[model samples]
Target: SVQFRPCINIHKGKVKQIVGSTLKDLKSDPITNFESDKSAAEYATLYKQDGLKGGHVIMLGADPFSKAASLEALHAYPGGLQVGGGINSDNCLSYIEEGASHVIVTSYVFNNGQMDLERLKDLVRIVGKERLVLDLSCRKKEGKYAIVTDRWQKFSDVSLDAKVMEFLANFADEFLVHGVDVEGKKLGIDEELVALLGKHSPIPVTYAGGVTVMDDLERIRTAGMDNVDVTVGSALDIFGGNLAYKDVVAWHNQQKV
Candidate 1:
């Protein structure tokens, strides 16, 4: 069964949903959909109360304030959360110590439009393979998915194909892939991508981006063969959209045997 994993996206020290492609730097100011006064810890506490596990706190930039707020969320949920944003071998353990179940990583391993196996191995040795979740978040181009980095501003040569998924599956416990083109748009999910992920990924995968309604959940289940989990942001009412957050939560809860 598919599940609804929660997320807290921190930008400039506040929780927000910004257009993925529009994100460049502070000077550029990505288009923001919702900015919440509620602390990341408050959202973490709410997810904790709802028994939502494997939710992630994503720090969108290098802001010290965003990092501090991310730490607060990890503290609130302890073993319940995964932390991402600037995660690498050097600092991965710090997040683990702060109570992250796994550290989601991307940019560090895929540097300069290529996969750096050395860095990937270094993170594995430091965090142990099981404690890592590879963030294979990508954008589609030329009929294939190319991993993107730096707030999804740059495209890497590494294509997210079945072979890549098989090889990387050995290095991490799970994969988190966001369809960058549709992320935070509230249009509709990339059903083709969902189906590809369902057919290819060997380990667990969570797909995020463009989920607009409950029907999309079923669409993911069918396209993903019930193997992929989902992370809905932007469209949920909590983030200023019409989709009932509680309904999605309830739908997720009902899936548990």
Candidate 2:
């Protein structure tokens, strides 16, 4: 009924690189549907090597452009992967049927570009929090991190404060927050975001974006979040970036032991 899901988000370019020649031949880039294939099975290749103790594999997703790309990753990989992006009451189950442990949600929970608790609750009622992951991905504004949505293009009036956290805790099992401003740049992790998660969030939270090195991982660990999970993308070589993928894997392994 419940699962600890950590996703590897293979953005479009990465798919183009990993499956390159093998899939490039296809017209319209059918490989964009990575979330629908077993190619993402490669993510499990390091499960044993990285000493993966236990965690459901999730395939993070995006919008129309990212939708097809995410689907390809799921198809490329198998096992407990989840998908998100542009998901609402209508198409939520599509990814689940295709091969997702569960589906992550964000924008759809808002109405007229604002946090609609009623809508959020409706989503929880429909999908059930046990199977839901609320993406609270945000951006730093006026020196404070403001929850951003609409693909990080719009900022919500809500702040990741105790009141908001307490409110959301009742609906979702976990939260997936991305430091959007620093995402992909890999300069560092959003420390304040970590602090907020540690202080107010009652459920498990996964902090993503801006993680570029092992030190950031250490910093997050030192922050005293034993339950929080992390995800690194773009910075890895596979994603046309330079961060060492194995080092991060090794860090997670060391933590397990």
Candidate 3:
């Protein structure tokens, strides 16, 4: 279903909305669109109260404060959310044990400019496939999408397509792909990428990035064929944009499965 999944992005211990493609910038820090006074846990409480599920709490950095906040978000919404950002085989279970329904991973399984099945095996052994969400978020290169690693800087050799999705689906219960090119700036939804995922992904998948207006939600349903789920940030009123969170919530609730 083209559901509107919520997200809480924690950077420097505070909830923020940052440009996905800028994390590896040359000098300046990534652009921040919104900085919330609310703690990560406080945001989780709102999702839980609204009957929203499967939201993501992305810990944008590896600082101690970010880790502590990730734990708080998981604790606040235990079993209601998925988490990502710097997850690896060694610490995958930490988030799971803390109540994340699933731990989202990428670099651990896709490194050295390619997909590393060996590392993925270790991760699955630690948390099981049912509790693993492979983040296949990518940026368009030569009109094709390449899974990005190392925080949107490294483009893994593998491109997201039907066969790749089928193979990865055997190892992960779901997929979370962010269209990095258009992420956070919110120019519009990356319908091209969203449609590609909708056309081929073999299991449950969520598409993030580039949502600027309410019609973009319907656009996901149309272009995504109702098979893809969506996440809206930066442009959402709750995160300080003009689009009402309640309106999106209503749309999220009204969509057909």
Candidate 4:
């Protein structure tokens, strides 16, 4: 069934929400919505207290500050959260040991514009298939969803489809996807993508992007057929939007009942 998964996005060492497609290199400036004075762990602690699980700590770049901040959140939650950004076989185990319940990965599993199954298998071998979450985050292209990498600026040859999902399902415990074009916009949910995932994905999937009002959660419940989970960022009160975070948390709890 659908649930409200939480998130902590760190950019340059602080919690913030930036336009997903605008992200390129760390040195380059991107459009930002909210930058919090509170540390990353502060948000993780809040989610921890509420018993929210399967949330992610996304490091937007290789900024040492951002990496450190993400680690802090992992420590705060202590096996309650997943960590992503630059995750590879070399460092996957470190994050798992440092309190991350799972390590989310994307770019590392693709090379030469294709899904490098060998590299993905190496990750699974190191962390075991159970502790890995494949980040299939994508952008719309030519009326199809194309996987994007390198901070969502470049598209890979792989596109999102049931074939790809089923092929990759054996390598990871779950899948996390973000609609890059609408991420951090708070306009509306990606109904088409949610419906597709709900019908296709063989394992648990979480959709993130463009969720504005509380009704949007209901949209996900119906459109996703209770087969997908959601993560709200810019629309939530904690992220400087009008939607009350408490109300969303309540909504998440209600789903459990």
Candidate 5:
């Protein structure tokens, strides 16, 4: 069965759903799919009330507002939300202590176009694999999925091969991969990336990007062999999209076997 994972993407202190590709720099307005008047903690409370977990609070910029909002979400639902963006060994435990069940990291491990094995080992030692979710978020390149870093603008040389995943699995309890090409497009889910991550990940994995409606969730379930969890953004009802958030939540509960 597939799980429904929600996302709180904070940019410049507000919780907004934007075109992932349009994110250029700290100052970029980015293309908006939905700009919510609601606070991040409000969504966190909603998910908590609905019994939804494994959702993430991501900071799109280094701004204090977004960072504080991220903490607000975690504080609202302690031990429920995972957190990402600018996460590292130095700050990972702070987030964990602040209420994140898991601290998500990407650029820290996959830096300089390759795996920082020593840094990875250090991170795992500091936070432990149990509380770590590796963000292997990628973009399609050279007919393969290549990991993107620096907030999805720069491409790392690493790709999502089974060998790579297996090795990295040693340091991570879960994997979060977002298909950059289709993220926030709402055109459709990236079944190819879904299948790829599903087939490769040995630990729990979640695929985010491009999900439109109910059918796309089914497609992810089938394509992912029911092993990969999913995230629907830019098209979810709660985020100004058509797919009903209630339906997705119902699907998640019913699919549990």
Candidate 6:
């Protein structure tokens, strides 16, 4: 529950447009066409406003499709946001150059199905940990949390345990964990994983996955995390659903600030 610590995932730029005076006929609004049908749509309305503050919006999704959506948020919110998806050592600075406060990286350092130490070092050496936010999202498999790469499609041999922190802490300033299996489902959080972050993580950790309403914000905030951040996708209205993104920001802001 910190002032606007929300990540606006452009959903890999699946969103056709961020803000427009009139919703385009061809591209449906997230509020009207999402997985859930509720008040979630109200969040998109908030995003439509000029200079809405109190949240760290992340444009989710990745690749060329989401690139346009990331730029759209930048164009709309300016320095008010961060962008993730298809970011790496070579092109990371470009996002910052495009007005992103920070660039989110996931698969770049895990090339060839293994952790690329040289690439990690190169990324940090070039961008600095202060500017890099490593996404160490994982999946629960065989009673263990295994690291996932390739947009949550492949599970790596890496374990999401105490050792992960030790390895990543050396090069990254922060960690963004998205419970891959539970992400975009709006069911519930991987409570087990959330607890670990509170206990073992040394740097700032942002949790993303399966958050559906404002109550979830409180649950995670009270779950041994005073400064942890959050990112909600799929459940938010702008993604063609009915959940309000503003309430997520507003609720957290009320308690933290």
Mind sharing the TM-score for model 2?
Answer: 0.76
Sequence-dependent TM-score of model 4: 0.97
lDDT of 6 by residue, 59-176 (tens): 4443465566556556555555656666777788887787666677778888667888888888888878887878788878898888887656676878788888877888876788
- Find the candidate with the highest lDDT and give its number: 1
C-alpha lDDT score of every prediction, in listed order: 0.91, 0.61, 0.89, 0.90, 0.89, 0.64
Of 1 and 6, the candidate ahead on TM-score is 1
lDDT tens digits, residue span 29-142, model 2: 432312323344465444433444223333233324546556655555443455675678777767667666567787888866578878777777777887677888777778
Off by over 4 Å in 3: 25-27
Clashing pairs in 1: none
**Cα lDDT of model 5 by residue, 169-205, tens digit:** 9888999999898999888978889999889899999
For candidate 1, lDDT tens digit of each residue in 143-235?
899898877878899999999999999999999999888899889999888988999999999999999899998898999999999999999
TM-score of 1: 0.97
Flag regions of model 1 displaced more than 4 Å.
Answer: 26-28
Tens-digit lDDT track of model 4 for 1-257: 67888999998899998777777683457889899879888999999999999999998888889898998899899989999989988999999999999999999998998999899989998999899999888878898899998778678989899999999999989999997778888889888999989999999999999999989999999999999999999888899899998999999999887
TM-score for all predictions?
0.97, 0.76, 0.97, 0.97, 0.97, 0.77
Q: Per-residue CA lDDT of candidate 3, range 8-34, in tens?
A: 999888899998788863227889899
Model 6, runs deviating above 4 Å:
1-4, 11-13, 16-65, 240-242
Give per-residue lDDT, candidate 2, residue 95: 69
RMSD of each: 1.2, 6.7, 1.4, 1.2, 1.3, 6.8
In model 2, where do residues sit more than 4 Å from their true spots?
1-69, 75-79
lDDT comparing candidate 4 with the true structure: 0.90
